[PDB]
């Protein structure tokens, strides 16, 4: 019916990072259209984020999480009871990017209608990831 302050839950199929959390102050990610910012009282909404960066500021430091990451792609829901859950395929820290190792044999693609869009997305995210390290 409503939620005091706010709770976030950030989960990955292989590990859950914040089962539930109030300590964060703000969340910023990038959608296709534009970069979005989620805080408390933010209205209910659905988002789908391509493999961009995800940063969350913490009031209190959380052990083993950095607060700035790179996800491979995710779904984000902001429910009615002031609660946002982030579900991503996989997530990692910017420092482990190990950039300049890209394009090691999967450059090859097939020319169809789908291979074109797939290459488009691949280049977009390669560019984005290169930029993020800076």
């Amino acid at each position: 019916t409503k939620k005091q302050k706010m709770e976030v839950t950030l989960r990955t199929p292989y590990k859950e990072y914040l089962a539930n959390f109030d300590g964060f102050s703000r969340i910023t990610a990038k959608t296709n259209e534009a970069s979005l910012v989620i805080q408390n009282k933010t209205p209910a909404s659905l988002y789908v984020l391509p493999p961009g960066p995800l940063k969350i500021r913490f009031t209190s430091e959380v052990k083993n999480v950095s607060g700035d990451f790179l996800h491979t792609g995710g779904w984000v829901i902001v429910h009615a009871d002031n609660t946002c859950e982030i579900n991503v395929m996989d997530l990692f820290d910017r420092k482990e990017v190990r950039a300049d190792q890209f394009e090691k044999g999967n450059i090859q693609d097939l020319d169809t209608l789908a291979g074109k869009y797939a290459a488009k997305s691949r280049k977009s995210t390669v560019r984005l990831f290169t930029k993020a390290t800076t």
């Binding site: 292989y14 296709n32 391509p50 890209f102 999967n106 169809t112 209608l113 797939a118 990831f129």
Partner: protein, 68 residues
């Protein structure tokens, strides 16, 4: 583009994300790399066996599409 990739081709979002990783798999840690693997087998049943091996997983193997 995820939206037009789905609209003008039958590309699921998981497939699009996977394509996106394809170029960057080696930059990522091995922990992430090990998860992005699809290898299974489909058997047709008419009281008989016809066996397809689903390993491509980005093209029309795991997720068929209009564009393919």
């Amino acid at each position: 583009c995820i939206e037009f990739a789905f609209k003008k081709a039958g590309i699921p979002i998981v497939r699009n994300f996977l394509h996106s990783t394809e170029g960057v798999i080696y930059g990522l840690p091995q922990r992430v790399q090990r998860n992005l693997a699809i290898n299974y087998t489909v058997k047709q049943y008419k009281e008989g066996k016809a066996v397809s091996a689903k390993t491509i997983k980005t093209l029309q193997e795991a997720f068929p599409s209009k564009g393919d």
